[PDB]
Amino acid sequence: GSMENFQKVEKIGEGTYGVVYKARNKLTGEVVALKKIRLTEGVPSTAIREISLLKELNHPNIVKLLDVIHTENKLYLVFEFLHQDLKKFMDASALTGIPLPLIKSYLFQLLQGLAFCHSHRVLHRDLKPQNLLINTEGAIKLADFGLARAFGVPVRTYTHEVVTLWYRAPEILLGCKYYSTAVDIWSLGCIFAEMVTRRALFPGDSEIDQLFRIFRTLGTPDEVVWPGVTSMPDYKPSFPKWARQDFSKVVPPLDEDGRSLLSQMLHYDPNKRISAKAALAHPFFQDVTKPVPHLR
Amino acid sequence: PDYHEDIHTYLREMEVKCKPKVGYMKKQPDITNSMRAILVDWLVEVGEEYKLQNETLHLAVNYIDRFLSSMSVLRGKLQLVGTAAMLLASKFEEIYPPEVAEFVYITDDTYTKKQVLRMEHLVLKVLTFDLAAPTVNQFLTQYFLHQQPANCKVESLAMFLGELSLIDADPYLKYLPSVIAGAAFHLALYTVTGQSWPESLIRKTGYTLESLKPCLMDLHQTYLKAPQHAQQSIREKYKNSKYHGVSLLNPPETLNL
Ligand SMILES: Nc1ncnc2c1ncn2[C@@H]1O[C@H](COP(=O)(O)OP(=O)(O)OP(=O)(O)O)[C@@H](O)[C@H]1O
Ligand SMILES: [Mg+2]
Numbered sequence: 001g002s003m004e005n006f007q008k009v010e011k012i013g014e015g016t017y018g019v020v021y022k023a024r025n026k027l028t029g030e031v032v033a034l035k036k037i038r039l040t041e042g043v044p045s046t047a048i049r050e051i052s053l054l055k056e057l058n059h060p061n062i063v064k065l066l067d068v069i070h071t072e073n074k075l076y077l078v079f080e081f082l083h084q085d086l087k088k089f090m091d092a093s094a095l096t097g098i099p100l101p102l103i104k105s106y107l108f109q110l111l112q113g114l115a116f117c118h119s120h121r122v123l124h125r126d127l128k129p130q131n132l133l134i135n136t137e138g139a140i141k142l143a144d145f146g147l148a149r150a151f152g153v154p155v156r157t158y159t160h161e162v163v164t165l166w167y168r169a170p171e172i173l174l175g176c177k178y179y180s181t182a183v184d185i186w187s188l189g190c191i192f193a194e195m196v197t198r199r200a201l202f203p204g205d206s207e208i209d210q211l212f213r214i215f216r217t218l219g220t221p222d223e224v225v226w227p228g229v230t231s232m233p234d235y236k237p238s239f240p241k242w243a244r245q246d247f248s249k250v251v252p253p254l255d256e257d258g259r260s261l262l263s264q265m266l267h268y269d270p271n272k273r274i275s276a277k278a279a280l281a282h283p284f285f286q287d288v289t290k291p292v293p294h295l296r
Numbered sequence: 297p298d299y300h301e302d303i304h305t306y307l308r309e310m311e312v313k314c315k316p317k318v319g320y321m322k323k324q325p326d327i328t329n330s331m332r333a334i335l336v337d338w339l340v341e342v343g344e345e346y347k348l349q350n351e352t353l354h355l356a357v358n359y360i361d362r363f364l365s366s367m368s369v370l371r372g373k374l375q376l377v378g379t380a381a382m383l384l385a386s387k388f389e390e391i392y393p394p395e396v397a398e399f400v401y402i403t404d405d406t407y408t409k410k411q412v413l414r415m416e417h418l419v420l421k422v423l424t425f426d427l428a429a430p431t432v433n434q435f436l437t438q439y440f441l442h443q444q445p446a447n448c449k450v451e452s453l454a455m456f457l458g459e460l461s462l463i464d465a466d467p468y469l470k471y472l473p474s475v476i477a478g479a480a481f482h483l484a485l486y487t488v489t490g491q492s493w494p495e496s497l498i499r500k501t502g503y504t505l506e507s508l509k510p511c512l513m514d515l516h517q518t519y520l521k522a523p524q525h526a527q528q529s530i531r532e533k534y535k536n537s538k539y540h541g542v543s544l545l546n547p548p549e550t551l552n553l
């Protein structure tokens with residue numbers, strides 16, 4: 001694989017260390033995305049991780065890294081092209097919303113992609129609608145592994161940054177020394193909610209705001225709901241103690257099975273929070289199909 | 297809890313694919329097991345100076361052996377390969393990797409920044425960016441979950457023994473990480489508590505003391521001879537309280553195997 005064989009079509013994004021282009025393989029006709037990575041500290045650790053981890057993760061619901069074009073001062077990652085991200089799609093569905101069969105199809109596929117990551121000891125750590133890509137056939141795929149990492153069993157302390165604030169799990173917010181796969185499930189719970197309402201479940205502007213928004217929705221956690229919570233580094237006994245509201249009021253359109261699943265993804269205690277693997281079998285998915293998106 | 301079985305199974309597949317060639321040293325015209333021992337021992341010291349994870353040390357060693365499985369290297373450039381490997385391992389594994397300038401500094405300025413960086417690129421090319429390799433350390437931490445009850449001296453001693461295995465290509469290059477971890481964990485358990493390889497780990501790994509015996513005989517010898525070995529950085533490092541001073545523990549004279 002080499003750059004002469006690609007004809008660039010248009011810019012489709014700018015991430016970091018480079019621009020992302022839509023391109024066409026002149027010989028095979030294959031349409032791809034080219035992520036450029038500019039090369040004084042050498043190859044960025046984010047790209048080292050993204051490339052090494054993506055090469056291990058071949059799955060229909062994970063963006064496919066096709067090739068790495070590796071030259072002098074330039075690094076090009078060749079990905080399968082996917083037409084749109086979930087955020088753009090939700091905005092396009094502003095007024096009629098997203099049909100339930102599609103929401104359920106996308107959630108089921110996201111859980112499959114995520115269970116495959118976790119089974120291969122990979123934490124994504126930036127699940128959000130902007131990083132989830134959709135095609136015209138009805139597939140949705142995890143993308144942007146620039147913040148991912150290979151974890152060990154059991155985990156040790158990893159980077160305390162991680163996850164864009166709106167999708168960030170309470171155990172990260174409360175500074176637990178150990179976080180694990182459950183952080184990606186929290187993000188997916190936030191995304192499930194968002195697909196249904198088309199607004200962020202917890203749109204905080206700061207870490208403390210984020211925590212309080214979560215507390216106001218799911219109740220302030222005590223030692224009963226989450227043993228160890230009051231000893232966490234960033235727990236403060238002055239935290240207001242909000243009552244947990246009727247869970248049917250969090251995402252009112254959801255019926256019983258959907259509420260059950262959402263509540264399990266948004267469990268405070270990381271140990272009790274549902275795994276992606278276990279969620280695939282939830283009754284919510286009894287009638288899941290895979291229709292194409294209802295919009296161009 | 298979930299994924300522990302899946303992950304172990306996956307790592308067992310990957311350690312086979314990520315294994316260096318057992319006979320590569322005999323195909324290196326200019327470098328020896330002795331030179332590689334010197335290099336690994338230095339990397340231990342580097343890890344100490346920068347307070348790097350043991351996992352980072354193990355990954356760097358895996359990168360070096362794989363690199364040297366397909367690339368001939370003169371003795372004057374072996375340290376350049378090792379420095380680049382350690383830089384890559386750090387970028388992969390560390391929350392806060394040392395800056396490149398820091399890596400240039402510990403090579404006593406034998407090499408330039410441009411050299412270190414060009415070698416980083418070469419190593420990524422040779423390894424085809426395949427950096428998420430299983431290590432003795434990764435199997436050890438899984439095995440540690442089967443202690444009854446957990447014992448910090450056991451854990452530290454097992455890490456110490458796994459680390460000693462990194463130094464000597466003969467014989468350890470022929471054993472898979474999961475098997476070295478197995479021998480190391482049993483030997484540690486036996487040294488500290490007199491217990492052995494638990495049946496719960498037979499169920500998990502399929503290894504018995506019979507299947508671990510060859511590596512364990514080797515490891516027992518390395519343990520006994522460790523005070524006399526030309527390379528001493530691991531023993532020195534494991535005197536620290538951080539590792540419960542386990543290098544001060546007496547090896548048993550017999551294993552009963
Ligand atoms: N395979 C692809 N097909 C189509 N579009 C893509 C593809 N990969 C990336 N893009 C577009 O480029 C954007 C940025 O790329 P990506 O998220 O992979 O890296 P990033 O540096 O994290 O980006 P950002 O900094 O914007 O979050 C994506 O959100 C998406 O819109
Ligand atoms: Mg992104």
Ligand SMILES: [Mg+2]
Pocket residue numbers: 321322323324325326327328
């Ligand atoms: Mg030789």
